[PDB]
Structure 1
Amino acid sequence: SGFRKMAFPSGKVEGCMVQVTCGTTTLNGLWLDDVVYCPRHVICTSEDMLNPNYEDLLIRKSNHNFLVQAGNVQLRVIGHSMQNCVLKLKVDTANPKTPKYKFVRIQPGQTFSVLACYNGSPSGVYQCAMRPNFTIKGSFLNGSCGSVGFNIDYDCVSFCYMHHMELPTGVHAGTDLEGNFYGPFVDRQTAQAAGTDTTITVNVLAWLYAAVINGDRWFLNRFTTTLNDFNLVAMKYNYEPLTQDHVDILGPLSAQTGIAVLDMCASLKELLQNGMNGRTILGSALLEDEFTPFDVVRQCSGVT
């Protein structure tokens, strides 16, 4: 028992972190096989960031201008290319610690672990979720760009995020490992505002199930609801609409607890309408939405 915001063990990703320097800009790179992936804004000066033309800026850069350091040893750059907003630096040495891996582009609501790095060195690991407005609420300072987000399935690391930018509001934006930004953000020092940060309803329901599994049952009520009635309440509270696909994904949690999904939806509806009343659920005074139904099943079963 006990329910914690848990990140995947970071070991497999620590073995891939390198430092990439171009001119006076130093950030993090991800070294898989003989390629180092890093944000393309590594080639920019603070002046260049105002309105960069990356293809033009890249013309003045050669293989030798990209300094890649793994631990205390220098990697030799034998090729460089730009794929969307990431740079792929081909090195002459394959990473001996390359785990089995995939590049995946996740959907909003999906969670992942972040290994926050500075100068190619890991400082911490935390669990995140891709917000419905395609931002992430991370913990990143200057130098953290190139830090990555990932999920692990036994021995295969699915990389889903690479940190690129901090918006004027302090929230974060980044790309998948193909260099495509999540959301409408661009790698430019221009004011870009995020959309509505709505609550991931399916995740809140999954966490309510986790709370029931752990003994926190005070919020369970004598009511039920329909998907349409529930969604009228959810829209009012800036909660994402719940679909039958979400109901399907909650099935194993409904089966384990014997609480029908629509019954848990009715409990959630009363929590939104009445508030917590100074009470807590799993040590939290607000409804947590950064655990997916898969995370709740995984944590409650002990998947390694």
Structure 2
Amino acid sequence: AGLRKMAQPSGVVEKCIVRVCYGNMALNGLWLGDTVMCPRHVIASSTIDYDYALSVLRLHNFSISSGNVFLGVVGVTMRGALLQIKVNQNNVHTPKYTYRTVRPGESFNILACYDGAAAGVYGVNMRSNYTIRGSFINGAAGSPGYNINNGTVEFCYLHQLELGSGCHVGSDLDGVMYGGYEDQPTLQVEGASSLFTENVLAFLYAALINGSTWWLSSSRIAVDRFNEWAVHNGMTTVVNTDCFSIFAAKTGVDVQRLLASIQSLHKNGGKQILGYTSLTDEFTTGEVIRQMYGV
């Protein structure tokens, strides 16, 4: 019984963290094969012309280390908001990996790194405005986001910046910044964050399975009518519902009743659900199924 925001085990990724220093800048890199990926603002010295910074770059000014082992830098290139740094040593601990760009509502794992070493690991969920609800301080850029699927590490995030509100932004491993934000120390408009409704539905189904039912509405509202309401009450639209069939079948409660309970919950934070804020949206149906039933 129970539901917790978990991280997948980090061991396979911990071996791929390096320290990347250039001048007075220090942050983290991801060492796969003979390449080190890191955010390009490590080489920055108002608005930054990265192409110029890369043109005055001397390779011997890098310091890239794995613990106390220093890696020779062979080449640098630009990959969007990242540097691709070729190093002279192959990482023997490189897992089987892929790159994937995550979508709003999807869960992944953050391995928070400082000085080129993992310091913590936690689960996150990409928000509707392409930020994550994180915990990073200066020095954590380059902290990787990952998923583990059938022995393959899916790299989806390298930490980049914190918006003026304390929301966190990274790029995918192709160097495309999530949300389109710029890696510039400037005033940037941040999109409105909305609660991801399909994840709220998964959470409320987990609550039913865990015997929490005080919040359950008797009323019923249709998907398309709820969606009209959602975009005026800070919640995303519901687009996929076939994933809820198994939960509706285990519980007897269909989505339309949960949608109506969601409206009621928004008019109460007058009571907790499973110890959480009633409308938490950090859990996916996939996460709930693994924690409730092990599959």
Q: TM-score, normalised by structure 2?
A: 0.96
Partner residue, 2:83? 87
Q: What displacement does 1:171 show? A: 1.3
CA distance in 2, matches of 1:299, 1:92: 43
The 5 A counterparts of 1:11-22 are 11-22=11-22
- AA of the residue aligned to 2:268: G
RMSD: 1.4
CA distance in 1, matches of 2:165, 2:285: 29
Matched, 1:102 2:98: yes
Partner residue, 1:298? 290
Contact 2:97/2:152 (<8 A) preserved: yes
Matched, 1:182 2:178: yes
Partner residue, 2:152? 156
CA distance in 1, matches of 2:90, 2:293: 36
Paired positions, count: 295
Partner residue, 1:259? 253
CA distance in 1, matches of 2:60, 2:258: 59
Q: What displacement does 1:167 show? A: 1.5
Contact 1:135/1:194 (<8 A) preserved: no
1:42-75 Cα distance to aligned partner (Å, 9 max, x none): 0012xxxx21111111011133222110011001
Contact 1:28/1:147 (<8 A) preserved: yes
Contact 2:196/2:236 (<8 A) preserved: yes
The 5 A counterparts of 1:122-161 are 122-161=118-157
Q: What displacement does 1:213 show? A: 1.2
Matched, 1:60 2:56: yes
| Aligned residues with identical type, % of pairs | 45
Range with bigger deviation, 102-111 or 62-71:
62-71
- AA of the residue aligned to 1:90: K
Q: What displacement does 1:256 show? A: 2.9
| Secondary structure of the corresponding residue to residue 139 of structure 1 | coil
CA distance in 1, matches of 2:258, 2:122: 28
CA distance in 1, matches of 2:260, 2:163: 36
Contact 2:197/2:235 (<8 A) preserved: yes
CA distance in 1, matches of 2:126, 2:72: 35
Partner residue, 1:248? 242
Inter-CA distance 302–64: structure 2 relative to 1 (3 Å threshold): farther
Contact 1:167/1:193 (<8 A) preserved: no
CA distance in 1, matches of 2:113, 2:50: 24
- AA of the residue aligned to 2:281: D
CA distance in 1, matches of 2:292, 2:15: 28
- AA of the residue aligned to 1:3: L
Partner residue, 2:229? 233
Matched, 1:77 2:73: yes
Q: Name stretches of at least 5 consecutive residues in structure 1 with no aligned partner.
A: none
Q: What displacement does 1:37 show? A: 0.5
Partner residue, 1:171? 167
Q: What displacement does 1:298 show? A: 1.9
Partner residue, 2:281? 289
CA distance in 2, matches of 1:61, 1:211: 55
Partner residue, 2:4? 4
CA distance in 2, matches of 1:55, 1:237: 43
The 5 A counterparts of 1:25-64 are 25-45=25-45, 50-64=46-60
Q: What displacement does 1:286 show? A: 3.5
CA distance in 1, matches of 2:273, 2:29: 39
- AA of the residue aligned to 2:214: W
Q: What displacement does 1:27 show? A: 0.3
1:90-113 Cα distance to aligned partner (Å, 9 max, x none): 112221111111111111111111
The 5 A counterparts of 1:204-219 are 204-219=200-215
- AA of the residue aligned to 2:130: F
Partner residue, 1:270? 264
Partner residue, 1:193? 189
Q: What displacement does 1:153 show? A: 0.9
1:219-242 Cα distance to aligned partner (Å, 9 max, x none): 222222211222233223210011
Q: What displacement does 1:116 show? A: 0.6
Contact 1:253/1:293 (<8 A) preserved: no
Contact 1:44/1:57 (<8 A) preserved: yes
